């Protein structure tokens, strides 16, 4: 009675993990959809003072971190208010790590940012260089 | 009897999420249509006075919200009248943020204006500086 | 006797099992590829007297049924002349759900219109709304 | 056997003894009119042959005069 | 046997599944490249006397028809003249549906058309209303 | 004992083909990411006296060839330097398979001329015919 339990056992197990592989399926199609982007919809300015980036950022998905900044080819951390949460409202990024010696030249012209978010998205941002 | 039915339980899940992926796309074809779109075509005036903006935008999609307004190189928030309804009719905006500290001096002129909606859209205006 | 008799009813019965396998997914093979697709050569315009849409649909499928309309960011229904036949020839929609409240307003411009078809496909429309 | 076009099974009646090799068909479909295909003349149509051995194939046939 | 059996008739099974696959895709890229295109290459006029319209189309692909054509916001249906055969040549449309009571204000001056073919495409032209 | 052993061989077997297709797949995603990409960044001229092209090409991949080229309508064949190292540095092509029969009328205009390279790109060229 080899093959009257044995092809049984396995077609009840094979029940098991085609369930599991289903489950696991639409389970990772309802992550990827939530999993959260992020787009600028406000035209920021950056203020070449003290590098204060005023951004506005529209977020339809979960809650992300903002890593990096991109700038004149160069990388560049940041350290505060970094948290998006959910929705448009706006978003004040104190971005370190450059001064005004570069940026007094370019006064009143445009610039292009490469913001690095956590979830793998970056988001290029055109900023305009106010004083 | 492994391959009796696990291939068979793979083939009949296949077409749920094929079926389901194809009436997302159709279902996401048909948002971003219909999704709201605004432009300008009435030559809007700006009075110097109380910086009352007398717009007029034509809205072929859905109703939308006006957030801010980009004026000078300064974002500007706004208070009432930013529900744009469907059709071109005629908005009137309170335009708050600004005085005529600097509108003064350009009484006749021309500047450009650019709204900032809030499905995403920017929409700029052709203004005509009037008292 | 039991593996000699067990083992031989078990690849008997996988015979079955996987001609019926194959049966199935052969006859989805032709399901799918005859079910119907729609979709628009005529350039269709929208009157604005009484929403009477005289649309130019190819068929190269089976006959399918209109259900509904998306205009403006609003849902509408439809009661008449929606039994599509095979064939381009030339279809008039009495779409009702709207008025010329919104319409007069946007006389010789265009828009987009959203049809939902029976089989799960949607059809953009651009339309011109004509008097 | 059958051809499935525009959501509608129709028969054959000759030319319809495959051999081995690809050599080339020549299918007499009766069983639809010039009614419809006259409008849809230089597109492209999906039939669904329909094979004795169960196998069905479908055909991206473009619609010539 | 029922393992030993059953992927076997599966994996014997997809090889023509495949092949079905792969040969449909290669017959359909076969037949969307020569499936027909209508450009317009010769500068037509439209003579207000009888709406006689003295076009030049090239066609690199296959046999069409011409089923409308839309001018001045109307649809307008066609008679004869309709079968363009591959190649530039010449073509001469008699285009009813229209009288000389709105193009005798037009005389010398330039139209633009839209014919919709058989096979999806649209062409607009350019015309010279002469008389 | 068939379906305790059979299963357990395919299921064992089904790893060593699944782990050769993932090892197959990531081979060739880093085969025809560093396959060799060359374009024009220096804008050539073309000598009227014999032909001899002073290209520039850049080429951020592997070592290519130079087979034929595109010029008039006319395929030409070519003999010597003809193989790109990686960089940009300067090319010379002695292009032969024409004279300077018909490029004595066009000294000092513009011409485009389309090499063929050995791994299936196509690059335009600008080229200015000199003397």
Redesign the interface.
Known sequence: ????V??LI??IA??I??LV??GF?FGL?GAFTGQGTV?Q???A?LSASTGTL?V?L?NTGATTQVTGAIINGNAASVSGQVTISAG?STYSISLGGISSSTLQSLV?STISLTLQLSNGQTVTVSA?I?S
């Open positions: 009675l080899s093959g009257a044995t092809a396995l077609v094979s029940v993990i085609a592989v289903v399926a199609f787009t919809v406000g035209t300015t005023k506005t529209k448009q009143g305009i106010t």
